[PDB]
Amino acid sequence: IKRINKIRRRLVKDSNTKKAGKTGPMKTLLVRVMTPDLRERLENLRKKPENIPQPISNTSRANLNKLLTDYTEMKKAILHVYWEEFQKDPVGLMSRVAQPAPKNIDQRKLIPVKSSGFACSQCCQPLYVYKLEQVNDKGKPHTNYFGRCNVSEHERLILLSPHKTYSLGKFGQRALDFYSIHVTRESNHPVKPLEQIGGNSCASGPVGKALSDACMGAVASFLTKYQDIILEHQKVIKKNEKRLANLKDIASANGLAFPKITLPPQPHTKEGIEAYNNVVAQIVIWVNLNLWQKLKIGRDEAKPLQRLKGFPSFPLVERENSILDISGFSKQYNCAFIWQKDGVKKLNLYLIINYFKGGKLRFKKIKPEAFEANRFYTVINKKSGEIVPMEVNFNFDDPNLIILPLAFGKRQGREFIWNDLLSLETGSLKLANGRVIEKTLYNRRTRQDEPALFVALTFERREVLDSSNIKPMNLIGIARGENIPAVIALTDPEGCPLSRFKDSLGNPTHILRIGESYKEKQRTIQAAKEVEQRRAGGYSRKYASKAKNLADDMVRNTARDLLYYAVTQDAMLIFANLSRGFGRQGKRTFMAERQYTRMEDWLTAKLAYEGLPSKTYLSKTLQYTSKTCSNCGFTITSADYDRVLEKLKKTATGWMTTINGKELKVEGQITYYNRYKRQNVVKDLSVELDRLSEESVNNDISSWTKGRSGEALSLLKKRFSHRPVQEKFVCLNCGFETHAAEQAALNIARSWLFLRSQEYKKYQTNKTTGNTDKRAFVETWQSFYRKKLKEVWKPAV
DNA sequence: TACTTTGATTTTCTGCTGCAGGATGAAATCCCG
DNA sequence: CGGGATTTCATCCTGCAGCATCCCCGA
RNA sequence: GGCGCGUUUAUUCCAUUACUUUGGAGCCAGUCCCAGCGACUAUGUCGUAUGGACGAAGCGCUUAUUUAUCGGCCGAUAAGUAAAACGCAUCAAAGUCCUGCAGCAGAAAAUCAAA
């Protein structure tokens, strides 16, 4: 039976546990606040429940609304002030937000600059550069660059990033002292958020400490993006000037009137970017009108300019959810998660937020087993690792409190609240922080979008598994296709197939197919879509997201099934070394057909939450795996058409060509998607070649300049090459016949085994002297695979 | 002097994904009763 | 003499190799 | 296209806690109440859906309440019929969030050029 939780239980039961590092895996719970609509929904069931919870009181709702409005206004005001400050002088803010080194890097500085990279704007003094060289754990030498000022107050070690001329490299949200400037009343800054916006009603500590992060994170992100994008602008300008010089020279060579417009110097604001893009667009329009259109010049010989893209805008000011933030869960920030003991295995959950002046949420430590009825309890986590159970007492009718009852399901509760293993009572799970989200949700009863209150609570796992004993031996190759989502094959370390799966007939085998019946489903959906489109020119809202939802369902289920098979079979998964975002980008393609990276990421995240690295069960490997027969190892190539076009000599019966000593009969018909006609036109290959040969003598290939060679190659690129049937596969050596997907799945695992063989090592050693080639790789492939077929990989007869 | 595709400027709308900042308590001083 | 409420502060390492794996077409 | 019931995703144990989705199953998709096309003399349709306006949306079983029907409610079945409770249709999976930026697309509209 296939459940992810059963797999997780199997993993936990099969391995030991250890304490997590400095920061462990983190997971988030998103639930909803018990509102009156949920109360009515619970009251309208056929079988009414015995005890319906009370909804959130009016006072809590009013206080929450007031707090949300004030928080949003404060964030806007601070962001506006820092936007103005950045506009006045970018360099000052850039140096101020720079994240200093930890106050423990006290290794003896050895070498200064061989100096004016930046400057400490606090004292307006140059920030002299100092060097520090060290060697990492793997032996690669690394040089650390630091900036130090002569001022005792500014005796810091700001990080610097060398460039081939220096950059900062880091922008932290705590580098700038936000609290002492805008929060405390001792400062004389003209802009004070809490004193002016909140009307002296909000507690300084928690609200200020929340605003600090809420603003500095955005400012740091914006500054990092700005700093990164400036260098790419320099590179683009450098690569663009030469190209425009070449284009101007070409235009002068044709004797046309080139416009007298010159590039502006590199800008640093959005208006300069706009002007530069306008000039580039004008130049490209002129080039299009004069060179490619009238004279028909190719793109490579006359290539356009490139626009300036990626310049960021200041957060939230250079122009909806309302967010109330909680910095942390400790007695200092005036927030708590309270649960009522009734029995040694039951809880009753609430969450209290006291952000107002004139509230009472006093704690007091209790004995480990001093629990009493009608009294609330909670736990507090320390840096030292100790857990102190403390009880919370307060007044339910407090006019300054915020009381939130939560609503969730059994799955979420078993995952976080009352989990069997990760029980937060003993400290195995720690509550990190939380948020309050106010967003619009669809109400089906009223058929309107209405505001709803959500609660997000992030939990950090403190005990993880030990990967020192997870050593899979067997292998599983996954071959993906469009007709079938996935076909897999199970092999032992030696590579021999393992007959442990069961087919429909129950016979032993080593092949399974996952997610079948898909193709007819999306084809029915597309048939309905096309019928509606032909009927009325458009489809209803139903067919907007059916394919996407079904594809997401299928990829999730396939990932779950392969995870189950790998875990229960003691095998390590192998995927194809496809670059991220790989897929077919054509005419009738859909974005719902790209589930390679999505699957890898889902599997990686699921393995990561348990504390194991991806290399324990998940891997990648290599190119030329689907085009290889399992009898001798012959492989066809797209570049192998050069062999076809090498002779192309003519006989009395027509054209003839040979590849690898095998005669090829030149005949066949070609049907291609003619975009000029938006239809399919069928042409005869021999007839096309004869029409080409009408204007040629002796039909010699070497007499071809550029064009007729390309047209003949495009004609010949179908012929008799590798594919009588798309799904069926036949081997050229002895006529071996087998399904293509199964062979591809087996060959992917065998390729992964190959990339760690000794032939590959000697290949790389020859690469050390320099042997970058293409034919040698395929030759080693064929030789190794033939040897392995000879020794251990007995073929099926 | 019939009536397709391509390359291109701008205008709007619907979506969908990548990538930075993240996931804070310990302790030292005022104010006060 | 506690008991809150407000202010300062400081916490982090170095990933290998294929010509294309659905991207090459005639005009 | 819409309208509602909801079960399973922990092994003897841990909230039919109730949230957000996916898949399956269940029911209604009609009314002439109007304006279209065949061709039109071009603010006026004989047959025909190109659009508009209203309405629609489980079945059983156990418990009083208006009549028929004869023995003078002791006779049950038909509707209106309160609430409790059960059964069937009807069954299985998943969830890591916030902020700010940009980048990818898809579809329409105003202008230059071509065999």
Tab-separated table of N, CA, C and O in Angstrom, chain A residues 375-410:
chain	number	residue	atom	x	y	z
A	375	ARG	N	-6.770	25.029	33.764
A	375	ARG	CA	-5.580	25.866	33.725
A	375	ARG	C	-4.808	25.574	32.448
A	375	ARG	O	-4.634	24.413	32.070
A	376	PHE	N	-4.358	26.633	31.782
A	376	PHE	CA	-3.630	26.518	30.527
A	376	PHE	C	-2.145	26.324	30.803
A	376	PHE	O	-1.647	26.703	31.865
A	377	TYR	N	-1.444	25.722	29.847
A	377	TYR	CA	-0.017	25.461	29.972
A	377	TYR	C	0.662	25.658	28.625
A	377	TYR	O	0.019	25.648	27.573
A	378	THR	N	1.977	25.846	28.670
A	378	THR	CA	2.779	26.022	27.464
A	378	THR	C	4.229	25.685	27.806
A	378	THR	O	4.548	25.389	28.963
A	379	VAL	N	5.105	25.727	26.804
A	379	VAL	CA	6.523	25.445	26.992
A	379	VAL	C	7.333	26.585	26.395
A	379	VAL	O	6.866	27.289	25.493
A	380	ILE	N	8.547	26.770	26.907
A	380	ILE	CA	9.467	27.800	26.441
A	380	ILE	C	10.809	27.137	26.167
A	380	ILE	O	11.284	26.335	26.978
A	381	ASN	N	11.413	27.467	25.028
A	381	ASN	CA	12.656	26.846	24.588
A	381	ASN	C	13.830	27.770	24.887
A	381	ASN	O	13.732	28.987	24.701
A	382	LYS	N	14.928	27.190	25.359
A	382	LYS	CA	16.143	27.924	25.668
A	382	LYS	C	17.239	27.588	24.658
A	382	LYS	O	17.175	26.583	23.946
A	383	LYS	N	18.258	28.452	24.598
A	383	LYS	CA	19.433	28.144	23.786
A	383	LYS	C	20.166	26.915	24.301
A	383	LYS	O	20.677	26.119	23.505
A	384	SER	N	20.228	26.739	25.617
A	384	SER	CA	20.937	25.615	26.212
A	384	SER	C	20.265	24.277	25.937
A	384	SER	O	20.867	23.232	26.210
A	385	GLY	N	19.046	24.279	25.408
A	385	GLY	CA	18.339	23.057	25.099
A	385	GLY	C	17.338	22.600	26.133
A	385	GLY	O	16.704	21.560	25.931
A	386	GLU	N	17.176	23.335	27.229
A	386	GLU	CA	16.229	22.957	28.264
A	386	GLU	C	14.839	23.482	27.930
A	386	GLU	O	14.681	24.542	27.320
A	387	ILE	N	13.828	22.723	28.341
A	387	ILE	CA	12.429	23.068	28.122
A	387	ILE	C	11.798	23.316	29.483
A	387	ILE	O	11.864	22.456	30.370
A	388	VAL	N	11.189	24.483	29.654
A	388	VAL	CA	10.561	24.850	30.916
A	388	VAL	C	9.047	24.906	30.701
A	388	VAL	O	8.540	25.813	30.025
A	389	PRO	N	8.289	23.940	31.220
A	389	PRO	CA	6.826	24.025	31.139
A	389	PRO	C	6.310	25.102	32.083
A	389	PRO	O	6.561	25.061	33.289
A	390	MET	N	5.593	26.071	31.525
A	390	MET	CA	5.094	27.204	32.285
A	390	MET	C	3.629	27.420	31.935
A	390	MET	O	3.214	27.196	30.797
A	391	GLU	N	2.844	27.848	32.920
A	391	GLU	CA	1.405	27.996	32.740
A	391	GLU	C	1.075	29.461	32.496
A	391	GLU	O	1.766	30.351	33.001
A	392	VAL	N	0.023	29.708	31.722
A	392	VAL	CA	-0.399	31.054	31.358
A	392	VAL	C	-1.792	31.285	31.921
A	392	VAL	O	-2.711	30.498	31.664
A	393	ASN	N	-1.951	32.361	32.685
A	393	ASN	CA	-3.245	32.765	33.214
A	393	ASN	C	-3.539	34.196	32.788
A	393	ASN	O	-2.638	35.038	32.748
A	394	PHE	N	-4.800	34.461	32.466
A	394	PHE	CA	-5.208	35.756	31.936
A	394	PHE	C	-6.721	35.874	32.072
A	394	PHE	O	-7.385	34.986	32.619
A	395	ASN	N	-7.270	36.976	31.569
A	395	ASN	CA	-8.699	37.247	31.630
A	395	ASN	C	-9.272	37.194	30.224
A	395	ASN	O	-8.779	37.882	29.324
A	396	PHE	N	-10.314	36.379	30.037
A	396	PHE	CA	-10.879	36.198	28.705
A	396	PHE	C	-11.527	37.473	28.181
A	396	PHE	O	-11.524	37.711	26.970
A	397	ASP	N	-12.082	38.299	29.066
A	397	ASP	CA	-12.732	39.537	28.664
A	397	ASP	C	-11.796	40.739	28.724
A	397	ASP	O	-12.263	41.868	28.916
A	398	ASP	N	-10.498	40.521	28.571
A	398	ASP	CA	-9.531	41.612	28.600
A	398	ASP	C	-9.758	42.527	27.404
A	398	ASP	O	-9.704	42.057	26.261
A	399	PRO	N	-10.010	43.823	27.608
A	399	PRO	CA	-10.290	44.708	26.465
A	399	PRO	C	-9.077	45.012	25.602
A	399	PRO	O	-9.231	45.694	24.580
A	400	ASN	N	-7.886	44.542	25.970
A	400	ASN	CA	-6.678	44.815	25.204
A	400	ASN	C	-5.999	43.565	24.663
A	400	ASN	O	-4.887	43.669	24.135
A	401	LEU	N	-6.624	42.399	24.776
A	401	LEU	CA	-6.032	41.164	24.290
A	401	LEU	C	-6.581	40.797	22.916
A	401	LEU	O	-7.557	41.371	22.431
A	402	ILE	N	-5.921	39.828	22.287
A	402	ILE	CA	-6.380	39.221	21.044
A	402	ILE	C	-6.356	37.712	21.238
A	402	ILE	O	-5.292	37.126	21.469
A	403	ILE	N	-7.525	37.085	21.137
A	403	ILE	CA	-7.683	35.654	21.363
A	403	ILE	C	-8.105	35.007	20.054
A	403	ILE	O	-9.069	35.449	19.419
A	404	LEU	N	-7.380	33.968	19.649
A	404	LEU	CA	-7.623	33.295	18.380
A	404	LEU	C	-7.836	31.804	18.598
A	404	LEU	O	-6.897	31.105	19.018
A	405	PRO	N	-9.029	31.273	18.347
A	405	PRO	CA	-9.195	29.821	18.250
A	405	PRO	C	-8.989	29.339	16.823
A	405	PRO	O	-9.461	29.937	15.855
A	406	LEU	N	-8.267	28.231	16.701
A	406	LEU	CA	-7.825	27.734	15.409
A	406	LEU	C	-8.708	26.585	14.936
A	406	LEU	O	-9.386	25.923	15.725
A	407	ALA	N	-8.690	26.362	13.622
A	407	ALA	CA	-9.438	25.286	12.984
A	407	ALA	C	-8.517	24.558	12.017
A	407	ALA	O	-7.904	25.187	11.150
A	408	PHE	N	-8.425	23.238	12.161
A	408	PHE	CA	-7.549	22.430	11.325
A	408	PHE	C	-8.088	21.006	11.283
A	408	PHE	O	-9.126	20.697	11.872
A	409	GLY	N	-7.373	20.132	10.574
A	409	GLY	CA	-7.787	18.763	10.379
A	409	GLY	C	-6.948	17.762	11.155
A	409	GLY	O	-5.998	18.096	11.856
A	410	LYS	N	-7.338	16.493	11.009
A	410	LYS	CA	-6.624	15.414	11.683
A	410	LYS	C	-5.203	15.274	11.157
A	410	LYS	O	-4.272	15.014	11.927
